[PDB]
Design a binder for these strands. Structure first.
Ligand SMILES: [Zn+2]
Length: 832
DNA sequence: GTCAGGATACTCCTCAATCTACCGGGC
DNA sequence: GCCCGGTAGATTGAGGAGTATCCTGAC
């Protein structure tokens, strides 16, 4: 009962056709639930007939208590290992298990289910005690090394020359194991031994980079290509050696390097691609194929499909970009027209690993998922726009009804669970452990959903199931604390780190368990905890930082980086930049604090000296979340850009007084000089007579010039900006205090007086005008603001309250403005 | 019958930036 | 009781390893 396609596929081995038909009923009885695909996969190998006959003969005894091999495991071994591996396993059933080797059946299957399984199994059985005792190697490492094609040679090479690489090259056994855990490990190890001094001395390459390069499939060829092409790539093409080793640290890096060398000028001249884009595209598996596909299909996708080159690069910037590009070219118009999905969604689906599988699954499953199960196409694209989208989508298709009618979960919860990397694992773990968690430990379904909705939720859920009782009982933590700890990316590592490190971090450095939970409740909390352990005494005795400050610095996503950056940059910022350590702690106690600290170090002198900004303003700007982009944007706008943009950016920092007095009329020149003097004195800075003469010359020589008095003391001068209020952007309100004499004093909403913080109008322009009149004894003046909502309903009373006795004020809202509510007023009103 | 190399596909772990919904004192 | 600000979460994107499976050439 085989189809034509199955017979054609199995006809690769001519002798397998006869044996399968004669005894077709025989394997079914011996191998229950054996699907035709498994049979055709087993029988299509070099010894399909022999392997099938051996399985049929031996499966009666291969299911014994010493092995207890499942049917799927037997089929996999027959397909991969062959007749030799099956015979070796059967002949040594009692040798592998129940022996000083101490090998589980899963490890035995993994070693056997590989090319040359018999030789690898014999080598393991002969050399496991030797490598365990003489070299002190973990049996897991030996199994991992031997679980590869030609693993016997790699194991023998490791046993032969582990001490040589350990001593004469200073390489840890872990690096050797990682290098030898790939195909052709013996050749890679020999190449490393013969080449490490040459690549480390003449080429000046870090041994870690060489180890990383050699820790891939075919590392010997990659190392040889690197040695042969490093000077050429560094000189002719101007490629950084770090970039070269990053490109060559993938599977088949030799082909990628050759393609890059052969096609860099072509893509950089006849295609417009930058070297960085080509490097990024080539920094993935199958780089040669991706580069060739990009070069061949760039005009086709750019013109016929209307795709920007950046989108093509991003699609090809992943593993297997050739298949994704071909699938996009084949399936863009038919899927877009017949389903109406935006091309951005199609790009987002294929912008990950295995995008072709996700795209095909979406094309197949959109109608049925949207019809029977009721998912929105946006939800489907959200689930498919992740690593392994095919697995998550097929799992949703298979599993949604039983999850939504038996376990009492909503479809949106399932959509959230399945919309993460490895969503199939999370879905299956939920289906397997939801009753257990909701019964044995009392966790609510919402907590389980929250735990399972991160990258690697299966490991987090299993870790919770294993470690929740012991953490909750021995360590005295409420289950809510463990749920909070585990509900993060890579939460298994954080949970194991907490279980390991709670007693020492409590009884050694005197940290409250709540502090440990706060440190560990963020992504990458294991690194934060280890860094706190290693650094806390250093920050205590060597710099006088309290443990509370260390915990506050570490209680963020980038806690390790922030702590290391604080340790490295505390003396320089505290001595050569004039920053108090408290300001450093405040800057670092934010998400991405390492970048903020480095940006402060880099841009403090240029901002403080060239543009005349106080260090306090820089610290305040950098003390907010995401302060690095804010500082970079401020530097960009201050160094170049529009005059009005620079003026607004400078005034928005606060403490800056601008003036647009006009004409000569020496009297108001004197008054303006007096006002500048008063502001400088209020800032504690003496402006001296030379700057008085300078500003007087500027005022007398530039008609209609607007000044700016920063808190530092520098007087920025702008030639011309505008004589009218700017457009209202919805959050920033601008005002000008026009006196009777003629002086115009600019104002901007926000950054109000801290003294009246409890007052709700703190920051409005009318309040700033009132305080300015009160301080400088201004009798009468008017205001003009460009708020389109009119004056606020609080200001009409509060600003009149702040006015001095006997003082007058006027505010004029714009004519085009309309009041938004009864509180607001959209007409001229005189206050007193 | 093995050994070495290349190509996809998938999972998990750490980081940095931005968005928003709950709380809270004043009206 | 009803806000609008503050801010502590809560997405959202990104990169970097680590893991697993399959196909091909050469003896
Ligand atoms: Zn106001």
């Amino acid at each position: 009962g085989f189809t034509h396609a199955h017979i054609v596929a199995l006809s690769q081995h001519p002798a397998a056709l006869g044996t399968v038909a004669v005894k077709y009923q025989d394997m079914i009885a011996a191998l229950p639930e054996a699907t035709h695909e498994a049979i055709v996969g087993v029988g299509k190998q070099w010894s399909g007939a022999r392997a099938l006959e051996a399985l049929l003969t031996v499966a009666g005894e291969l299911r014994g208590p010493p092995l207890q091999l499942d049917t799927g495991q037997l089929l996999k071994i027959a397909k991969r290992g062959g007749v030799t591996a099956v015979e070796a396993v059967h002949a040594w059933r009692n040798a592998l298990t129940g022996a000083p080797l101490n090998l589980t059946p899963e490890q035995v299957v993994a070693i056997a289910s590989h090319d040359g399984g018999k030789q690898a199994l014999e080598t393991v059985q002969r050399l496991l005690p030797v490598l365990c005792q003489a070299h002190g190697l973990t049996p897991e490492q030996v199994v991992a090394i031997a679980s590869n094609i030609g693993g016997k040679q790699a194991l023998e090479t490791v046993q032969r020359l582990l001490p040589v690489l350990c001593q004469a090259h200073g390489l840890t056994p872990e690096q050797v194991v990682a290098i030898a855990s790939n195909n052709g490990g013996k050749q890679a190890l020999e190449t490393v031994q013969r080449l490490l001094p040459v690549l480390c001395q003449a080429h000046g390459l870090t041994p870690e980079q060489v180890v990383a390069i050699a820790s891939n499939n075919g590392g010997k060829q990659a190392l040889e290509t690197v040695q042969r092409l490093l000077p050429v790539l560094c000189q002719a093409h101007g490629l950084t050696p770090e970039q070269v080793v990053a490109i060559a640290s993938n599977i088949g890096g030799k082909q990628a390097l050759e393609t890059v060398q052969r096609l860099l000028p072509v893509l950089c001249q006849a295609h417009g691609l930058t070297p960085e884009q080509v490097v990024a595209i080539a920094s993935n598996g199958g780089g040669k194929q991706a580069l060739e596909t990009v070069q061949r299909l760039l005009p086709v996708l750019c013109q016929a499909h209307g795709l920007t080159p950046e989108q093509v690069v991003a699609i090809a910037s992943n593993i297997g970009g050739k298949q994704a590009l071909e699938t996009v070219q084949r399936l863009l118009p038919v899927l877009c027209q017949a389903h109406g999905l935006t091309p951005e969604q199609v790009v987002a689906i294929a912008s990950h690993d295995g995008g072709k599988q996700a795209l095909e699954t979406v094309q197949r499953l959109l109608p049925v998922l949207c019809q029977a199960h009721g998912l929105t196409p946006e939800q489907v694209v959200a689930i498919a726009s992740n690593g392994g989208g095919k697995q998550a989508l097929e799992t949703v298709q298979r599993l949604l009804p039983v999850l939504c009618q038996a376990h009492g979960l909503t479809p949106e919860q399932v959509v959230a669970i399945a919309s993460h990397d490895g969503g199939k694992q999370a879905l299956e773990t939920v289906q397997r452990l939801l009753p257990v968690l909701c019964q044995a430990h009392g966790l609510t379904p919402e907590q389980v959903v929250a735990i399972a909705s991160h990258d690697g939720g299966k490991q987090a859920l299993e870790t919770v199931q294993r470690l929740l009782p012991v953490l909750c009982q021995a360590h005295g933590l409420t289950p809510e604390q463990v749920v909070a700890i585990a509900s993060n990316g890579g939460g298994k590592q954080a949970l194991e780190t907490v279980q390991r490190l709670l007693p020492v971090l409590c009884q050694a450095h005197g940290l409250t368990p709540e502090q440990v939970v706060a440190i560990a409740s963020h992504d990458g909390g294991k690194q934060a905890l280890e860094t706190v352990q290693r650094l806390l005494p250093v920050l205590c005795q060597a710099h006088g930082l309290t443990p509370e400050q260390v915990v506050a610095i570490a209680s963020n996503i980038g806690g390790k980086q922030a702590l290391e950056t604080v340790q490295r940059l505390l003396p320089v910022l505290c001595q050569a930049h004039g920053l108090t350590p408290e300001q450093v702690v405040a800057i670092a106690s934010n998400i991405g604090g390492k970048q903020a600290l480095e940006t402060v170090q880099r841009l403090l002198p240029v901002l403080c000296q060239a543009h005349g900004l106080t260090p306090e303003q820089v610290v305040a700007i950098a003390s907010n979340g995401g302060g690095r982009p804010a500082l970079e944007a401020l530097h960009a706008v201050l160094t170049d850009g529009p005059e009005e943009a620079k003026y607004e950016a400078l005034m928005r920092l606060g403490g800056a007084l601008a003036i647009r007095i006009s004409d000569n009329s020496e009297k108001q020149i004197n008054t303006a000089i007096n006002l500048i003097k008063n502001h400088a004195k209020s800032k504690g800075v003496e402006l001296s007579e030379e700057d008085i003469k300078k500003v007087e010359k500027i005022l007398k020589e530039n008609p209609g010039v607007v000044l700016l008095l920063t808190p530092s003391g520098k007087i920025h001068v702008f030639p011309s900006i505008s004589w009218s209020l700017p457009e209202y952007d919805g959050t920033t309100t601008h005002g000008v205090l026009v006196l009777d004499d003629g002086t115009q004093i600019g104002f901007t909403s926000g950054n109000g007086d801290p003294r009246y913080t409890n007052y709700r109008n703190n920051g409005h322009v009318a309040q700033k005008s009132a305080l300015y009149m009160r301080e400088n004894n201004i009798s009468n003046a008017t205001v003009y603001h460009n708020n389109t909502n009119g004056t606020c309903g609080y200001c009409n009373t509060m600003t009149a309250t702040f006015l001095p006795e006997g003082a007058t004020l006027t505010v004029v809202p714009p004519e085009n403005a309309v009041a938004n509510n009864s509180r607001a007023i959209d007409y001229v009103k005189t206050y007193t």
